[PDB]
């Protein structure tokens, strides 16, 4: 989650300049705009990994409601999948950003 | 550079990502047989590291134009018909050691 950030931080002030710039690009106005003042400043450290996994996937001889599926024997369907996964490894979180499969 | 670079299939993160993805696959599939990994053919990773900056800002109209040579010395308007101010919320994703920033979100309301 977000936490308090001090405007003393170089990165905070650099982000103000950026956003003010973006405002000027967006605005229909001949006049330049700049910040009167920051009224709130927060930061969130972002740290994760994207996994890009190209995999071939087969059909086992077990149903999905069965046990010990990790070493369940293989069979005829064989697919190619490209997965993209975002992980925050010390939070033990993972999220599927993209899954694209075809028969192979 | 954070990547995308080839990541060892021996790494625990790569293995977990695979178990997850294959789980998600199975979870969303309609067929009643369990499917699992036959061969990882390529495994890559990209380190995502940065800072999200959430700034609420009051933006003011200056007497300088956008095309002026120097924008160091730009007072705000004080004349009734010209004076403008907006209250804005920006979210900026920053990767400092890269010197990159992207405006992820922005909302400004006339104030």
UniProtKB/Swiss-Prot annotation, chain A:
Source organism (scientific name): Homo sapiens
Protein name: Cystatin-C
Tissues and organs where the protein is expressed, per its UniProt entry: Expressed in submandibular and sublingual saliva but not in parotid saliva (at protein level). Expressed in various body fluids, such as the cerebrospinal fluid and plasma. Expressed in highest levels in the epididymis, vas deferens, brain, thymus, and ovary and the lowest in the submandibular gland.
Disulfide-bond pairs as recorded: 62-72, 81-101
Compartments (UniProt record): Secreted
Primary gene name: CST3
Motif Secondary area of contact, residue numbers: 44-48
Subunit structure: Homodimer.
Keyword Oxidoreductase: no
GO cellular component: cytoplasm; endoplasmic reticulum; endoplasmic reticulum lumen; extracellular exosome; extracellular region; extracellular space; ficolin-1-rich granule lumen; Golgi apparatus
First and last residues shown, out of full length: 38 to 146 of 146
One Gene Ontology MF term: peptidase inhibitor activity
Modification Phosphoserine occurs at: 6
Broad class of where this protein is predominantly found: secreted
Gene Ontology biological process: defense response; immune response; negative regulation of blood vessel remodeling; negative regulation of collagen catabolic process; negative regulation of elastin catabolic process; negative regulation of extracellular matrix disassembly; negative regulation of peptidase activity; negative regulation of proteolysis
Medical condition linked: Cerebral amyloid angiopathy, CST3-related: An autosomal dominant disorder characterized by cystatin C amyloid accumulation in the walls of arteries, arterioles, and sometimes capillaries and veins of the brain, and in various organs including lymphoid tissue, spleen, salivary glands, and seminal vesicles. Amyloid deposition in the cerebral vessels results in intracranial hemorrhage and premature stroke. Cystatin C levels in the cerebrospinal fluid are abnormally low.
Family membership: Belongs to the cystatin family.
Function per UniProt: As an inhibitor of cysteine proteinases, this protein is thought to serve an important physiological role as a local regulator of this enzyme activity.
């Amino acid at each position: 989650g977000p936490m308090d950030a001090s405007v003393e931080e170089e990165g905070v002030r650099r982000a103000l300049d950026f956003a003010v710039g973006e405002y000027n690009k967006a605005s229909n106005d001949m006049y330049h705009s700049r910040a009167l003042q920051v009224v709130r400043a927060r930061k969130q450290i972002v740290a994760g990994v994207n996994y890009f996994l190209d995999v071939e996937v087969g059909r086992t001889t077990c149903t999905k409601t069965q046990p010990n599926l990790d070493n369940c024997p293989f069979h005829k369907r064989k697919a190619f999948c490209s997965f993209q996964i975002y992980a925050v490894p010390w939070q033990g979180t993972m999220t599927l950003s993209k899954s694209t499969c075809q028969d192979a």
